[model samples]
Structure formats: structure tokens, C-alpha cells
Target: MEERNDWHFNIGAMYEIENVEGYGEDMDGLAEPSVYFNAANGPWRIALAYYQEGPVDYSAGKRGTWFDRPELEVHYQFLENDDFSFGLTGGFRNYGYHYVDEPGKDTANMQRWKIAPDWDVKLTDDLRFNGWLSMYKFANDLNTTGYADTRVETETGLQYTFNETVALRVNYYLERGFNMDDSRNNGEFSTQEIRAYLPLTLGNHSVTPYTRIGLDRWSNWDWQDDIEREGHDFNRVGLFYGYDFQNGLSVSLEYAFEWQDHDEGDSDKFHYAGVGVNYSF
Candidate 1:
């Protein structure tokens, strides 16, 4: 959904890779090639995006596929005026895979349901406040694997406009997960951070430089190794550049790098990059 217009179509592909901390060049990553269509009128927006899993042709990672997840989303703004608008979004994703032949077996990985609220306030002529709170419930095979069933994500940001072509935003973000049966008092966790980005837009070209300072961070080894390990966190830096043509087409490039600080032992660092192109109509 490119612009909140009445109807639009978009297709893009992104590649992501990250290093395995101390594992030298042994990195891990994934690709997402997506196609989505949006239909919106007034304060409602509806869309379904199919994101294909990648490395379309390969023998390692170890191989790739064309089919993956399809997410359907519906959003509505309940409060709107000149100064602010508030909305909620609901979405669903089906995870299906079929590589094995079976008489009575389905290779669905998992199913996900999500709901989030979005808000934006015009605090001043050149300043704004915006954010969203999202909750996710992972069910089916995902919960069966002992992973957390519920996750929470939220971000709040203050943005200031510098003319019509540039702006800066500082944001606070938080994310956490709850285990099934509600055993862990503190819950499984993800990292949170204070971040900032300076976005520049001139004509049809745009560029953004982003920085993040992580706060408290911790996570278990996994569901099997559910041994809690909490300690030092990470800091990150990234850049994004995109260009749009007069013909309703666009291209973009992105890169990010992160380093961690450990409480006990040396930890891993990661770097990733991506590129995408889109057509809007």
C-alpha cells in the first residue's frame, strides 16, 4: 500500500543477511519478495500481501521456495480531525509449506494474528508525535515448539520538520513476549532502544540516516535451552536511500550494522543490506 489512495499495487523484493557474531563469515539471512494490493476509501484501508520466501534457486541455506506467507490486513481510523487521527489495524498471516509428500499431513509452519493502534498528533506547526502499539499471537505449530505465544511491540516518536524536504525523528521502541501457561514472571524478552533518524527528501529522491542506542536487553537461548541469559545490549546504525520517478516507480537501498556488549563473554556482531524496487498504480 503505497499511498492510501483508492486502489494501488506494489511489488518489491528485499534481501537481508547478518553475520553470526564470532562465526566469521558464517552469516544467516533471508529474502522477502512481496506483492500487495490496497484499496482504501475515506478512513479505511484494506490489503493483502503475499511475501515469497527467497533464494529462489539455491542448494544452500540450504534451498529456497517461491511460496511463503500471505497476510491480509484491514485498518480504520476511528478518530480524525485537523490536529490528530487515531486508528487500529488488524492483520492475519498464514504460514504454509509443502516439501514433503504425505497422505494426511499438512506442512503449515504456523499462523499469526496481530492488532495494533496507530496515532498521530500535530503538536506544532513543524512538529508531530506518532506511534503504535501492536500485539501478536502465534499459534498452531509455533506454540507447539515451546516458543512464546504472545508478543508485544510498541514505538513512540517525536518528529520535527525542517522545511518540506527534511525532517528528524527520535523514537522509543519496546518489544516483549509472554510464554504459554504464563510461567515466567518477567516473560521472554526482546531488546528496546532509543533511536533517531534524519530523513531528507528533495524532489523525487530521499535519503535517511538512522542511529539507535539500545537499552536493557535479554533473551533465553531458545525454548529448549530456555535458560535465561540477560546482559549487555547492542547499538546500531543504518542508512536508507530511495528514489522515485515521475512514472510511479521507485527504487531503494538499505544497510545496517550492529555491535553488542556482553556482560560475561565476547558476543557477536551483525551487518545486513537490502535493495528493492516498486511500481505504484
Candidate 2:
């Protein structure tokens, strides 16, 4: 919801497109359009968002497809004050994906429903804790390779805001695949990251530059009967610049790079860049 002296309402839309270059692949492009609306009536808050992504290309040695996702969220602020505040959120998401591999090999997929609950707590005047949990249900006869790919994720984080010009955030996430045999399974994965944000104004525009670093770790499992099970650490770093325009419009450009090192002595690196535009009314 938009900041207001009373009950507030907001509606906005965003468009983003990413083009793949180099990467030694024939990955086409991604076009995403999103619509979002929010309403705040007293202590009750509600929000809805829908997004559609299409025309994905992985034709170079990989299959590609289109996807769509819609989500709805409702939240309540049970207590709101200066020194302490708490809230609860519940939401659902519907996801669908289409994959075409050659001519006779194709796949259609759907995740009927996913539920998540999130909460935030203020630990100090400038520090806070936030977390979320999600459950998923996968489509039938549509496993991704050897894995079911439908799983559960639990995440938690701590955020600190130092004055108004700088802030820091750290988070940890764990994902576990469900209903799979121990031998033919992918073990749990964990990720940790820290981000820093700094704001600078150019002329009449406000721009914020941000950076993030992270690591990924995989758990141990039976490898003789399944895929490799050794855990390795990876690093990710990114830079983003955002501008706030007049009339409630904003835009941002970002580039990120990742370095992956495998326990099997394999390593790789990649880069991604994109632009995003949003308008509010």
C-alpha cells in the first residue's frame, strides 16, 4: 500500500525484458509483464499480483518454454506502534510451464497451489528479523529429470537500517525435495547472502546502488546409486542502480555475475543484465 495519512490504495504495473548474449548458448529472451494492486483498510492489508512470462528460448542444446504465475496475498497488522510492530501474511501462487524438446518430446506442467506465511519482528530500533515458509504441489507425470522438483523452502533473515542512506541485509534459505528415495535424490541445499544499499542523487533523480554476495551449499547423500553428492561453495556478486522519476515512476538497471565451483573440480562463471520499468497510479 502507498504511504498515506488514512486508508490507502495503489495500482502499478511493470515490464521487464532480458536478452541473452554470448553465454555460448542459443537462449532467446524473456518478456515479463506484471500487474499489482494493493488496498489498506484500517489495520487490514491486501495485495494481488499477476505475471506472465513467455517465449523462453533454450533451443541451443537445451529445451525452452513459456510460463505464467499468479499470486494473491492478504496480511494483517495486529499491532502498529513506534517501538514495536508485528504482522502475519498468507498467500497462494499458481505456476505453469510449457517445455518443447525437439518435435515428439514436449512437456506441460502446473503447480496447482502453493501456500506461504511470512512475519517480521523488530529486534531493536534499527534491526529486525523476517522469515517465510512455503509448500508446493507438483503436476502429475511431470517430474523434472530424475527429481520431482516440487519441494518446500524455509527462509529467515536479519536486516539493519543505519540511518536513511545505508542499510544491510542477510538471509539464509534451505530447500528440500520431498517424496523422493534417498539414493535417487538431491539433498537439501542452503544459501546465504548479504546485501548493501547506498543512495545518491543525480540532478532531480534519486539513484541507489546496491551490491550482494552469497554462497550455495549442497547436502550429502548416496552418490553410488544417484548423482554426485558432494557439497561445494559458490559466490555471487551483483550491482544495481535504480532511479525514481516524477509521477510515481521508477526504473532500474542491474548486472550480476556468479562463480560456481564443484567438488568434482569443475568450475564455471556467467553474467546477466536486465532493465525494469514500473509505473504507479
lDDT string for model 2 (1-281, tens) is 34654656666666453444334333334444456788775556777876554454542222323345667778755546653255556666556545544454333555544556656654564677777777665665433432355567777776665564556566655566443457544544323344445555676555554444332343433256754332532334555666677677676666553433335434434455655665544
Q: Global lDDT for candidate 1?
A: 0.62
Clashing pairs in 1: 21-268, 59-62
Candidate that would win on lDDT = 1
Model 1: per-residue Cα lDDT at residue 88: 85
lDDT of 1 at 165: 57
Write down the lDDT of every candidate, Cα atoms only.
0.62, 0.54
The residue pairs that clash in candidate 2, if any, are none
After the best TM-score superposition of candidate 2, give how far the Cα of residue 65 lies from its true spot, in angstroms: 13
Residue 8 lDDT in candidate 1: 48
